[PDB]
Symmetry: D2
Subunit: 259 residues, 4 copies
């Protein structure tokens, strides 16, 4: 199979990558970073996120795998010590694929983005004020620091820090959380995180200022003269190559409770 | 069709019920509170919850409708002034059915319960301490006041007060929230609400004391010599009779933002 | 000096107590559990809390010291291994006293209680609903699970679990936190914890049911036919005997961040 | 007395100001915006905050008064309709002064600032990571969006939105709240807001990046090559001219519960 390997670019990760490439040389495996079928990321979740965005135009043709040299690995299944076992298993085509939901962001002045973790919106530094419209229905006028829309796998990231729920990635949904909402006599938001199914469309519309800092995972990005920001669950999915059982809730336990 | 009407039992609700029965007398509609096909609740959500539990052995044969004389009505679609329009529409079979997910609780010493909103667990007054087991995997030792497991329609109730996410009821899931968790050097919980798909089983197991106060919606219930408490999304669903568009997110807006 | 020692009552604590008493026998130190000037607690914070309540009628005549055999010790300064150094330092009168604020609870049908950590109020099992009156001014109608009023040293306990602020115990104040407040169109609470100075009086008044479960630290206590529950910062203080520097914020760091 | 009046600068506020000046012309009152003894603000809390910062070098020589043409007025005592009664009462020297605590911010590369509401720190857009040092004791490594340090009167503002406690302004203290803290296996913060007495010093120190966006009330301000950010309760206080009883907790009730 065609494969490539991205590295965090430190000594540890670069050497592990060189060793895996040497190991793949002993099988029918071609290194191709233009049209790979397998993308191996060696580093942290940041490296993994970069791999995803490198190859987001061929998501349906790629299965992703992560090796963690950190630190945490929510998108790592593998420790560096098991790199040889992985080469072997991967060479013999010994895996089933698992798909996770993604988030489509549309910015209208249209620019469209795909997020694996989340997309957030904040001011250019003045007040944030936006109207939140759900399936063409006006839901609330949000005043505060910003808003975050998360995929299920993203719920353990920024979402978690904002008080969001952790959602199993078999659920096809997206989750909206508030950053520092203003609530008083005058000014009212729901307060609570909101979980939306497939085919629901959440639209953010400016009230005064039309300049926003928009993030998509690790990318952040001042957008000027914005008319609308639209969120929905993508029709596209990320596919992981999976080689043993490592359930989501065990990954959550390992990352947050104890390992 | 066979129908019945439950009332909150105050003057307003009883008279509305008598008037609807008189109105149904002008159509091919038989009052039968043993085997109804339509159950009309007149009161608040408490009255509605009682109606549901009255008839939970024939959920697949019944479509529910709520008239609110309160106050709030998350399970009300109807104001008292529209009672005549409802009699008319209902008589002519002019409706599509909408189904919402339910929560199965199993208490092992087996007693099984069905919740429309939630089931909660707290101590008999001493410390609460339970082990939380997800699909046979030990996830955490919870120390605090209690735990709440919510259906999607229940997410606006007790769940919301505990910091839970609001979930659209088209999502087949259940949501676990903490009550006053202890977190320190020693003692660790996830903190965050957790959303589980269909077929996931969350099990609570005692550590010291085996006596718990368990609630299922409005029913609460000291259980003695408990071995296990098991939660999963039910295979059963509640069916509503629905006569116009009144989207979930608009109901949420109306109940929490402004009406 | 007159002293006594309370023990958690396990093997470890009882033996440490016997050894300290033997060590005190070599100085001018009289064991007197009726009118002690020093009260040594050996166990956890629960043991310490019991010691405090044992002797709350002679708080101005007593200095308290805690040895932790647990676990956590917010009211422990001492590990079991330093028990000999403590006997020595204490025998030679080698200490300055530090005072912490206390909370006065008055229950009117008057019963008055003193809390070192907190006093809480919940239902007898039905709805909790109370009117919150601050210095004779009606502030809110609280609907939810209950309320907690904390001393500064108590802010690390139940208060912390309810989202309360941690307050340095040099601040003469009390802090009110909510348990699962209901907030919607109809029903409104402040949401936020509230910190009150000395001489402010917070009064809770029943709306329907007049039966409440009231806790004062580890004591809990169904009160019937309640007219009022009144909170204010006590004029009385707890005195600790203190032998080296162990700042509050370092105790907090050690108990919650890492030790 | 020497006085001046700042206006929000809309039609309503400018005309009210012109009318008050005309009314003051009938008493022994000199308009002096260089060395006033009374500073009247007409607008919102934003206008009030600007007045405070206009005159922060002569805080001990000035008593402040606010008229609200909004909206909310936490620093307003007065509605526009009572402007005449105020001119009269103020002319006759008919008032007692009330003082509120302030927050000193020191930024070391020293620049010092005084806040009436709060000072916050966030990244220049990369990760925020800072070491939190309390009275020279290392307390935590904070990873997240930022931190907020609030005065007692500021606790109803940004602080409240971040989950902070509301504190009565007779308490001489400052309150530190987190913005979106990261908490996992690796990375740990206290979570809870922290309340510090007078004479406690909280210091923030950079870990990697040394560029921060620092706010002081409405002023925000990229600081480059930062070595330290230091917070303590100021020795300086803001004085209000006060003409009738309008207790803090009633102001809170009116702004957040109902008016
Ligand atoms: N999926 C997931 N779960 C848990 N942790 C994750 C995940 N993805 C990344 N990370 C962790 O994010 C950290 C840097 S990844 S770079 C971009 C991500 O930063 C995250 N981020 C940004 N600000 C915050 C805050 N304030 N809190 C939590 N997470 C944040 C956000 O989700 C972005 O997608 C590092 O500790 C990773 O292990
Ligand atoms: N589904 C739903 N959404 C929103 N509000 C609801 C719902 N169902 C009932 N209610 C409201 O609950 C109140 C009493 S219903 S009796 C049993 C329910 O009480 C609810 N409960 C109990 N304690 C609390 C607290 N502390 N907070 C919120 N909700 C609570 C819980 O969900 C139970 O299912 C009344 O205001 C109803 O309009
Ligand atoms: N002051 C203080 N700080 C931190 N931890 C404390 C403190 N005092 C006691 N404790 C801890 O409380 C636990 C049992 S003490 S018995 C009575 C106390 O229980 C506490 N309690 C009760 N329910 C809860 C919940 N749900 N969360 C936190 N704390 C709770 C409350 O403050 C009472 O005063 C044990 O881990 C002690 O180390
Ligand atoms: N003291 C006080 N209490 C309550 N509300 C206040 C106060 N001071 C100002 N305000 C309100 O802040 C709003 C704009 S004032 S301009 C600078 C202030 O903005 C506030 N701010 C900035 N971001 C937020 C967020 N996200 N939430 C709450 N407050 C925020 C912060 O406290 C700054 O001092 C307006 O509604 C005022 O009535």
């Amino acid at each position: 199979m065609k494969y490539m390997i991205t590295s965090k670019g430190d000594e540890k990760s670069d050497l592990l990558r060189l060793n895996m490439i040497a190991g793949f040389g002993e099988y029918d495996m071609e290194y191709d970073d233009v049209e790979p079928e397998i993308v191996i990321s060696i580093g942290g979740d940041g490296t993994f996120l970069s791999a995803f965005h490198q190859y987001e135009e061929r998501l349906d043709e790629i299965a992703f795998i992560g090796i963690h040299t950190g630190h945490l690995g929510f998108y790592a299944d593998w420790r560096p010590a098991e790199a040889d076992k992985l080469v072997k298993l991967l060479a013999k085509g010994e895996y089933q694929k698992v798909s996770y939901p993604l988030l489509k962001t549309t910015v209208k002045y249209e620019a469209t983005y795909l997020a694996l973790n989340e997309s957030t919106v904040k001011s250019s530094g003045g007040p944030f004020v936006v109207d939140v419209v759900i399936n063409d229905i006006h839901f609330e006028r949000f005043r505060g620091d910003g808003l975050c829309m998360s995929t299920p796998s993203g719920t353990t990231a920024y979402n978690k820090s904002l008080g969001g729920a952790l959602m199993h990635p078999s659920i096809e949904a997206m989750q909206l959380t508030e950053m520092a909402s203003i609530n008083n006599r005058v000014y009212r938001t729901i307060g609570s995180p909101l979980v939306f199914p497939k085919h629901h469309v959440v639209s953010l519309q400016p009230v005064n200022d039309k300049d926003f800092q928009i993030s998509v995972d690790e990318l952040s990005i001042l957008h000027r003269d914005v008319q609308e920001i639209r969120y929905e669950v993508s029709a596209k999915k990320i596919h992981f190559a999976r080689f043993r059982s490592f359930p989501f809730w065990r990954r959550v336990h390992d990352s947050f409770i104890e390992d």
